[PDB]
Amino acid sequence: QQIIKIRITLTSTKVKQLENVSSNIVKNAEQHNLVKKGPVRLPTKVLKISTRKTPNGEGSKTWETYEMRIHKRYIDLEAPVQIVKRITQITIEPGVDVEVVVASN
């Protein structure tokens, strides 16, 4: 056990599934008494695509715009090596992309 100064990055398209896992990480750690920079939310990027609806060129020009919403979150902890490998192999979610790094760079 040594205090490793950790940075976790949560990124997903599903808000409920993202803030579930984030708030889950926030209470599971802080009931368990560590040093936390809580969920720090990053500007949700909206990736847009603009298309004509019709497959061919006939008809009035109807444009449609699809979008995909990417929400990104990051949580800073300092823990020992044991609660990191435990908290990060569990809390696994489909659709949430969890990233755990040790370093500032």
């Binding site: 990124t11 398209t13 990027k45 990736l47 995909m68 990417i70 990104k72 192999q89 696994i92 489909p94 992309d97």
Partner: protein, 56 residues
């Protein structure tokens, strides 16, 4: 590896589609109703939801 977060997330939804298709073509006679992919450590898990699993 080392892809943008953006391109990654759009690359993930491209994957689901191609798989969704492949299973709709392959398993049609088995009653394939759709898929979901859970990415884990060490594995990636593919769940076929189909009405006759024994021919799967």
């Amino acid at each position: 590896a080392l892809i943008s977060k953006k391109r990654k997330l759009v690359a993930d939804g491209v994957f689901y589609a191609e798989l969704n298709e492949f299973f709709t073509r392959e398993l049609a006679e088995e009653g394939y109703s759709g898929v979901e992919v859970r990415v884990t450590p060490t594995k990636t898990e593919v769940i076929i939801r189909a009405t006759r699993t024994q021919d799967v």
